[PDB]
Ligand binder design. Structure first.
Ligand SMILES: Nc1ncnc2c1ncn2[C@@H]1O[C@H](COP(=O)(O)OP(=O)(O)O)[C@@H](O)[C@H]1O
Ligand SMILES: Nc1ncnc2c1ncn2[C@@H]1O[C@H](COP(=O)(O)OP(=O)(O)O)[C@@H](O)[C@H]1O
Lengths: 98, 48, 49, 374, 333, 130, 374, 187
């Protein structure tokens, strides 16, 4: 099951735009997903920092909210999603076969 | 062509004539209103 | 936006139509004001009698 | 029947505070916000419930649209008030309102139907044996402990000034100005846009209000503070958003409350609070002004910004004659003063004569509130 | 020079201008039909996408290369601003008040330092809540520190509510059977209820004399459901409360609902709050004007944007409740 | 409300008539004066309210009356250029000590009779032919 | 004679226009796109001079990635701005920036760094002698020829409504909605994927944008349109692809612009554009509302949907009081009218006072744009 | 009227809205002959209400506030002023005069100014003065229909008299004796 991490309330427009793009892509391709809010629950927000690997973090501050997980497999951020959208390798990127 | 020349002339004449006839109607209606105001006020002074 | 002369001709046509419409509306409101003034005539003359 | 203790309920624009009579502090304090489902999709967390009331609505901001039942001290949505009152009586104080008297508060200059509808709703839907409607700024003077002075109240919906001399209020000198915390919050959103941050929805409104309650202060000198803030980054402070990123407000922390002293920032042509208080003093007689200068009392949650007292004293001292002596009384517990004096007012022995009985309501309809109350 | 300007334009453009002035867009035609079609070729194929991608790729490959007149090098051709520096204030004075009080505050932690910082009057340095709990009591309470960043309120978690377990078909069948032991029907927040199913509920409640309250909150209901409910309300004499909040009902549908109020005297509470679009002030005026006609309804939940209709609706509700009070008083004595 | 009706009656009649006759004869005199002064150049004014709206007539009148050169009027059919043309003449009047109250360029552009008549009267009274 | 006047550069969110002042039409029209080689180093580093700009970028759609340097009216990447600006100055206009003043446009409520960075780029890289920054909505009101009205401007990144009465702007009633044509493009892709035509990358973005421009329309009644589209196929049209394959749009022609009026389709908690205009009018004073009802002006490329004006007039008349009249001015050339406004505003003789010359910039720096402009 | 229109929920605060309130007062205010009876009538029925249209198309209903605003002319305690009403002021100004000239003053009361254009002011003033005055004297209130301009009209009379050419403060007199000359010539 795909879990996307979404900040419902945010002061930056680009974050909401990226989250809505990911939601639209999962919505259109008939792909079942979980809708998880980091602002509404502290536990999942703390777990989301905890799962992601250190070799690709933001240097200053907490990582950006839009993240994709497959169960507890970690798929990636919005950057890898956009790169796989360009390279037509999105299904491999989420880990869903074919 | 030539038909375009009389078409341009026809459209210009139609627009200018519509503007002009609207102008006389409004203008001689303004004359009419002014005459009405004159006679009304003086008859109404007779009332007073 | 194809050319400047096209917009100049278009603005001439637009100005002619717009001015004619404005004159039409002004004539209409002057007409109903005239009717009101005439009603004032008739009432005043009856009161005079 | 000394076991029957009345309930003191203050219905502010932002927060509702309820408690028992004869107590120093209110038992329940919670915002008056009604949350309703969004239209983007179905919610995750609730089933048969139609709406959320109180802190439950405040916690679930991401799936709800938030509405305020009080707009500028006026009850626009009466069913929302019934929901708020039901939550207050059944979920916070855990008492049946049938057995207790109720005391309520009101802004000075209101539509006359407000008191009538409030009395009718209370008597019909809660079956209280007795009730009373009082005015907030008299309760503030009760809480302060003196019987002479001018009360300048600024809540979340309205600002009002009233003078009192020896317990006689002057109704012709009462001034009401529409400037409160909500307009300051909207201006804070408008002045947080040019730094890059954007806030649109109602959850963003609550976030901005939380920022304002903790970061804003009133500058003593506006031009000198502006030059100081342009000179260096000493005044800058950082805030943590719920998403995780950190913002830095910087200059505009003292620009938000400056609208209370210069309303032209909001585009309105009214005067500031200092000019309003001075005009309210000038509307009184010549003789009593000397007392009213000495007993200026601040109240309301909006006057909780630091540095407001010295600034207001400086402005009024500029306006007033040099001979006169001016001091500003700012109690440290003033945010709840409107409640506190109510707890005094229900404790007095004379006030038992002033209740509105169920029988008197039964003969006289909801119009008994005008004859029985001020 | 109008003639010269028109001659400067193309003659084909002049004929096109004459045709366009004769056509004047397509105001007569509807919105869909006024657009022109792109091509006359019939639709063919199931849209094989890889052919599109490959064609676009080779189209990109066999393209003649535009050569720009001037290449870009990122050259800065203007004077740099070079902001001015200030001599600032190089002052240095030691206060040295007390050898005792030097060592007292020399080793103090920042958290306890902020208390004496706030009590002396540096309100600008720390947050306001911190500043006030510093002045609250005569002890060190401040734990955070002036340098530290401020964090928002967390409030309290709310437990998850069980999802709606009310089935659709059995409930409708029991409603159609006039079940004596079914009084409350709850349809709040149910996924994907068909519109004809909701209409079937609407005619099902016409002949039901045992259900007292109804609710379709958050069902994405629309105008036909509103019309069917408005038809139902005239027949029914038992329904007490109708709840249609959080829906997609337009203003005309709500007008149809309020237009059914004079005919029936059994409804006491109606809630239409939180609709997708505002109803408009004309609909509000009609609502309040002919809600003044009705005398049975007691509770009405709607937030009026205007002030006049809101005041008149509040007065009408006051009058209805006062009628209830008066008839109770007259019955007593 | 017969007394209020009679007050509105007197207001509608006598003040309006006594102002209208003065305004008519004043504008008829002013048209003759401006036509006599504008006849040196190839210009003529047939309507006081409409010909002074556009602004070329006014700037040419100030040209001939001052005898001294004025800046180029901006060329354009829209309202903004008309506002510019009226504003430049108003500024030229502002230089040579003439004092004006309630004068805006949009007042002349919109065509208020009182203000254009007052402007022409001020030109006659305070300005110097020289 | 001032070096053939200034240059008007309308740099929109999705497409840029440039030309000379005093001309009715812009000389250069081309999209604001930067195309880069996607991932490969094949064919001797094919994709040389890696930055492809404008028409040449959309020529090689298959082998490149297209990036928009302007998103939501805010410059994400500044090097791409100065590359686009270099292309405008040298590759198409073919005029030197040293002797020509530059006029620039921007959104109303934007972060304050954008003005300073544009001033720094104009004065430090292209060393222009004078420069000014304006607002697109004021330029639209200039192009309409009126000095009183409310202006909507909706480009590819931003929608904003401003009221102006008698040449006086009301800053408190200016609104900014972040719902533009890019969101409509994304929604069109979302509803096309359900039909069976899946469009993903930037070449697909250009194709879908072309489909939307050529085949969309605003339905007068949405439910009637749904019933008509379900009943028959007369509303269906056909679009051919560049290779030759032909697809049918059908139900997707009118669902795409409806998200302008109902943002619930897009997943955004916001009101429609008609509600934005009505709320901007209600935020003005009592008296000047009527003129704002009679002078509604539309602008921008988004408003070239067929039937948008009549539908929005119907919505406004549904909201507005019935006594006065509502009319909507929708010029057929409105997509360019913003630029035309610049061609008027740089042509005025009184505007020569308002130029920001290089001499003042060399003493004040990039902050002078806060004092000189607006 | 602004402060009493606040009671119905309508809000007017700016200086531009004061002109709107003034227009409402001029159109829809009248002086009730009896105040308590009018309050009872307005409370019992809604036949006294009137509707006004705002400049932005809103419709408001005045109702009971039509006659409460002019009633403040006769009871100044509504504004907090402790002064007496206009009828009491007129009676006190009559009573300060000599005994002989009172009989002519009772029958020659003249109203003037725009504020005295409320419909029904003359009957109320006559009734109150007749209540205060002794019974054997008769009271006549003279209210010309064009009284709003009376202060102008008499002035237009005064400058047309022959002897008023001997009244003018000349330029030479002001030049000789400064600006304080106006007390010697003007009353
Ligand atoms: N610590 C604080 N500092 C500054 N402002 C505050 C603080 N706490 C609350 N406020 C302001 O006070 C408002 C609440 O005031 P409140 O006392 O509820 O008014 P009311 O008189 O209507 O009850 C909030 O909207 C907030 O803006
Ligand atoms: N003929 C058309 N029909 C419908 N929509 C159009 C048409 N032409 C352009 N558009 C829309 O307008 C948008 C372009 O707006 P534009 O004027 O470039 O914005 P900006 O103000 O940023 O320059 C495109 O996204 C497209 O959806």
């Amino acid at each position: 099951v795909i879990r996307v991490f979404i900040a419902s309330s945010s002061g930056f427009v680009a974050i909401k735009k990226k989250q809505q793009d990911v939601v639209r892509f999962l919505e259109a391709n008939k792909i079942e997903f979980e809708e998880v809010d980091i602002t509404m629950s502290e536990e999942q927000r703390q777990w989301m920092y905890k799962n992601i690997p250190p070799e690709k973090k933001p240097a200053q501050g907490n990582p950006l909210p839009p993240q994709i997980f497959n169960g507890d497999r970690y798929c990636g951020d919005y950057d890898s999603f956009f790169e796989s959208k360009e390279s037509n390798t999105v299904f491999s990127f989420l880990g869903l076969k074919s | 062509g030539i038909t375009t020349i009389e078409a341009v002339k026809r459209k210009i004449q139609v627009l200018q004539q519509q503007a002009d006839d609207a102008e006389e109607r409004a203008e001689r209606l303004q004359r009419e209103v002014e005459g009405e105001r004159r006679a009304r006020e003086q008859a109404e002074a007779e009332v007073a | 936006a194809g050319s400047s002369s096209l917009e100049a001709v278009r603005r001439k046509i637009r100005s002619l139509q717009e001015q004619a419409d404005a004159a039409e509306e002004r004539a209409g409101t002057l007409q109903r004001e005239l009717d009101y003034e005439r009603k004032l005539r008739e009432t005043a003359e009856a009161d005079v009698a | 029947d000394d076991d029957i203790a009345a309930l003191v309920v203050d219905n502010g624009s932002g927060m509702c505070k309820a408690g028992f009579a004869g107590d120093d502090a209110p038992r329940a304090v919670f915002p008056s916000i009604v949350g309703r489902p969004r239209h983007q999709g179905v919610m995750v967390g609730m089933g048969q419930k139609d709406s959320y009331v109180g802190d439950e609505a405040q916690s679930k901001r991401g799936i709800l649209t938030l509405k305020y039942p009080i707009e500028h001290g006026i009850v626009t949505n009466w069913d929302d008030m019934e929901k708020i009152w039901h939550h207050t009586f059944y979920n916070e104080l855990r008492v049946a309102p049938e057995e207790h008297p109720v005391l309520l508060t009101e802004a000075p200059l209101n539509p006359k139907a407000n008191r009538e509808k409030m009395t009718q709703i209370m008597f019909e839907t809660f079956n209280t044996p007795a009730m009373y409607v009082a005015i907030q700024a008299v309760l503030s003077l009760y809480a302060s402990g003196r019987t002479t002075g001018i009360v300048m109240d600024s809540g979340d919906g309205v600002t009002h000034t009233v003078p009192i001399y020896e317990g006689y209020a002057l109704p012709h000198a009462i001034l009401r100005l529409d400037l409160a915390g909500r307009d300051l919050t909207d201006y804070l959103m408008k002045i947080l846009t040019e730094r890059g941050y954007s806030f649109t929805t109602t959850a963003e409104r609550e976030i901005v209000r939380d920022i304002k309650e903790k970061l804003c202060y009133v500058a003593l000198d506006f031009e000198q503070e502006m030059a100081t803030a342009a000179s260096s980054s000493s005044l800058e402070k950082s805030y943590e958003l719920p998403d995780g990123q950190v913002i830095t407000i910087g200059n505009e922390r003292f620009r938000c409350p400056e609208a209370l002293f210069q309303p032209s920032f909001l585009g309105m042509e009214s005067c500031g609070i200092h000019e309003t208080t001075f005009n309210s003093i000038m509307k009184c007689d010549v003789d009593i002004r000397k007392d009213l200068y000495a007993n200026t009392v601040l109240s309301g949650g909006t006057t909780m910004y630091p540095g407001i007292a010295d600034r207001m004293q400086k402005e009024i001292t500029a306006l007033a004659p040099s001979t006169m002596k001016i001091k500003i009384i700012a109690p440290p517990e003033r945010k709840y003063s409107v409640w506190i004096g109510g707890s005094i007012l229900a404790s007095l022995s004379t006030f038992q004569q002033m209740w509105i009985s169920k029988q008197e309501y039964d003969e006289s309809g909801p119009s008994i509130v005008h004859r029985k109350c001020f | 020079d109008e003639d010269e300007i028109l001659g400067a334009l193309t003659e084909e453009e002049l004929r096109t201008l004459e045709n366009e002035l004769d056509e004047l867009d397509n105001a007569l035609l509807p919105a869909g039909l006024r657009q022109k079609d792109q091509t006359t070729k019939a639709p063919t194929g199931p849209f094989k996408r890889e052919e599109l991608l490959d064609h676009l790729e080779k189209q990109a490959k066999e393209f003649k290369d535009r050569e720009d007149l001037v290449p870009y090098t990122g050259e800065k051709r203007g004077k740099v601003w070079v902001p001015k520096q200030k001599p600032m204030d190089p002052v240095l004075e030691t206060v040295t008040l007390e050898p005792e009080l030097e060592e007292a505050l020399a080793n103090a932690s920042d958290a306890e330092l902020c208390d004496i910082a706030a009590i002396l009057g540096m309100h600008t340095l720390m947050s306001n809540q911190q500043y006030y709990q510093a002045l609250g009591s005569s002890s060190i309470v401040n734990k955070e520190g002036l340098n530290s960043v401020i964090k928002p309120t967390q409030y309290k978690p709310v437990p998850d509510e069980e999802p709606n377990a009310t089935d659709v078909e059995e409930t409708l069948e029991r409603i159609k059977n006039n079940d004596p032991k079914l009084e409350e029907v709850n349809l709040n927040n149910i996924r994907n209820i068909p519109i004809p199913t909701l209409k079937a509920y609407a005619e099902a409640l016409k002949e039901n004399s045992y259900v007292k309250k109804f609710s379709i909150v958050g069902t994405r209901s629309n105008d036909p459901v509103a019309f069917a409910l408005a038809e139902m309300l005239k027949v029914n004499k038992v329904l007490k409360t109708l709840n249609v909040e959080s829906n997609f009902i337009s203003g005309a549908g709500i007008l149809r609902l309020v237009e059914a109020l004079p005919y029936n005297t059994s409804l006491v509470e109606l809630k239409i709050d939180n609709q997708s679009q505002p109803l408009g002030n004309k609909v509000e005026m009609e609502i309040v004007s002919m809600l003044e006609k009705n005398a049975t309804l007691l509770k009405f939940g709607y937030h009026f944007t205007q002030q006049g209709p809101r005041l008149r609706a509040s007065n009408a509700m006051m009058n209805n409740n006062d009628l209830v009070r008066k008839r109770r008083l007259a019955d007593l004595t | 409300d017969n007394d209020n009706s009679s007050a509105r009656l007197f207001e509608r009649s006598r003040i309006k008539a006594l102002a209208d006759e003065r305004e008519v004869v004043q504008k008829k005199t002013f048209t003759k004066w401006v036509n006599s002064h504008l006849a040196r150049v190839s210009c003529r004014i047939t309507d006081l309210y409409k010909d002074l709206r556009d602004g070329r007539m006014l700037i040419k009148l100030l040209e001939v009356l001052s005898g001294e050169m004025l800046p180029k009027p901006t060329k354009g059919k829209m309202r903004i250029h008309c506002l510019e043309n009226v504003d430049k003449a108003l500024q030229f009047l502002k230089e040579q000590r003439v004092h004006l109250e309630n004068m805006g360029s949009h007042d002349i552009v919109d065509g208020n009779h009182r203000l254009v008549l007052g402007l022409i009267w001020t030109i006659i009274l305070r300005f110097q032919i020289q």
